[PDB]
Amino acid sequence: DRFKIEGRAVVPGVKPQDWISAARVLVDGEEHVGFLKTDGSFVVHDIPSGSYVVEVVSPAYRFDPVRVDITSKGKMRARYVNYIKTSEVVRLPYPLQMKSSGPPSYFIKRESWGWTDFLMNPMVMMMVLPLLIFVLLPK
Amino acid sequence: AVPPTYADLGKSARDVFTKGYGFGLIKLDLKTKSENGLEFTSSGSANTETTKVTGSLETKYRWTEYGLTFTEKWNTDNTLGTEITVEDQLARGLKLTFDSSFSPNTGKKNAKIKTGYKREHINLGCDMDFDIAGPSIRGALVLGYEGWLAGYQMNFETAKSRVTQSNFAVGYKTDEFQLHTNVNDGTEFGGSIYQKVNKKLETAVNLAWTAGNSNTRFGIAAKYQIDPDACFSAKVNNSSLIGLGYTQTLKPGIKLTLSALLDGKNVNAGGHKLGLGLEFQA
Numbered sequence: 001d002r003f004k005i006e007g008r009a010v011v012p013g014v015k016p017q018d019w020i021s022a023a024r025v026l027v028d029g030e031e032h033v034g035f036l037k038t039d040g041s042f043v044v045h046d047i048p049s050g051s052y053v054v055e056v057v058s059p060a061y062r063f064d065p066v067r068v069d070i071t072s073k074g075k076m077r078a079r080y081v082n083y084i085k086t087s088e089v090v091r092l093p094y095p096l097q098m099k100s101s102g103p104p105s106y107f108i109k110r111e112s113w114g115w116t117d118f119l120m121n122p123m124v125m126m127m128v129l130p131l132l133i134f135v136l137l138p139k
Numbered sequence: 140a141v142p143p144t145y146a147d148l149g150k151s152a153r154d155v156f157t158k159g160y161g162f163g164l165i166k167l168d169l170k171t172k173s174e175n176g177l178e179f180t181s182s183g184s185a186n187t188e189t190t191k192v193t194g195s196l197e198t199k200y201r202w203t204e205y206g207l208t209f210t211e212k213w214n215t216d217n218t219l220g221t222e223i224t225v226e227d228q229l230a231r232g233l234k235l236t237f238d239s240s241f242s243p244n245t246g247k248k249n250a251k252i253k254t255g256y257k258r259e260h261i262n263l264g265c266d267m268d269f270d271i272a273g274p275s276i277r278g279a280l281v282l283g284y285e286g287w288l289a290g291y292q293m294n295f296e297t298a299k300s301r302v303t304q305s306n307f308a309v310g311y312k313t314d315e316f317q318l319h320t321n322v323n324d325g326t327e328f329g330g331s332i333y334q335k336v337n338k339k340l341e342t343a344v345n346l347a348w349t350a351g352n353s354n355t356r357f358g359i360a361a362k363y364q365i366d367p368d369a370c371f372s373a374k375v376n377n378s379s380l381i382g383l384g385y386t387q388t389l390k391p392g393i394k395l396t397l398s399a400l401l402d403g404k405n406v407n408a409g410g411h412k413l414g415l416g417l418e419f420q421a
Contacts, residue, residue: 116269116274117269117271119250119269120239120248120249120250120269120270120271121239121248121250122221122239122240122241122248125237125239125250125252126221126223126237126239128237129223129225129235129237133228136229
């Protein structure tokens with residue numbers, strides 16, 4: 001007994017054909033691999049019964065994995081990915097519609113010190129009094 | 140001349156309410172004056188309810204050569220604080236205050252600039268607070284002619300929005316009658332009266348009113364010195380709060396103060412808050 005899973009992924013903007021390039025979807029991670037269509041859709045066949053996590057892998061805009069439960073009779077139940085808990089959290093319709101949030105942060109941020117902010121230093125403030133006193137002399 | 144500032148306005152009544160009793164806390168202060176200019180203060184506060192030990196070493200350097208004052212303080216949570224005060228440098232009544240705080244263990248810095256203009260009957264003050272959260276600017280201006288005095292305080296912050304905090308304090312201050320009414324944004328309404336019948340009798344009354352929930356609370360305090368070394372203080376609040384304090388000079392510098400706050404009812408529910416205070420001056 002074999003079944004198929006189809007889904008549709010919509011990017012907020014850009015171009016679907018721009019994002020299709022170098023885009024694949026994983027069901028277990030190395031066992032079953034699906035490829036996307038020209039606009040966007042993952043269609044996977046040759047699957048057994050069981051529970052699998054569908055995740056779209058992309059160096060570009062990332063996606064949230066979605067848990068899918070396959071029954072032998074032919075019922076398909078999709079849920080949120082939960083590891084600590086193993087119950088039903090929220091049930092959503094079957095036609096997978098992933099919405100990528102955006103580019104994940106790959107690099108860290110480093111900030112410099114502001115000009116108005118470096119005036120708070122214990123040493124910089126002890127020079128401002130001599131600076132003002134010496135400025136008020138020629139004036 | 141030299142009209143009272145906003146913080147000092149009414150400070151007599153609060154000080155009567157504040158000084159005298161420290162129940163729940165242990166007071167231990169030592170003050171030392173040197174010959175030339177050195178001032179050393181070591182104070183230690185001990186709590187029995189929360190079992191906490193608090194204290195600060197304060198070193199004061201009074202330099203009358205140029206009007207400079209150097210203050211350095213140290214707390215118990217690894218907080219370091221320095222202060223420079225300059226008065227009568229080039230203007231008539233101009234005072235510049237610089238306060239800095241730095242921590243050596245962790246890394247934290249805070250800055251504060253105070254400016255004060257004092258004249259015949261005009262008082263100006265501006266405090267600029269520099270912190271990572273957001274700089275703030277606070278200005279207080281006090282004006283009076285003979286006994287009629289009124290002050291205005293404003294607080295502004297650039298970090299959030301056009302936030303403005305208004306304060307209008309109108310009072311009548313004379314030799315033995317001191318009345319002051321403080322208004323906060325037309326929301327807080329405080330009124331303090333303080334008077335002295337003789338050189339041994341002092342009475343103070345405080346009232347608090349609000350416009351939000353219409354909460355009213357009043358309290359009266361009496362201070363009477365039996366002898367130049369023996370003094371007694373009593374305070375009664377609106378609902379049931381009573382507090383009694385007694386101070387006596389034991390050695391010519393050594394003084395002992397005892398404070399007791401009683402909150403008792405008649406439904407088998409009562410509580411005592413006691414406190415001892417002791418200071419040395421040299």
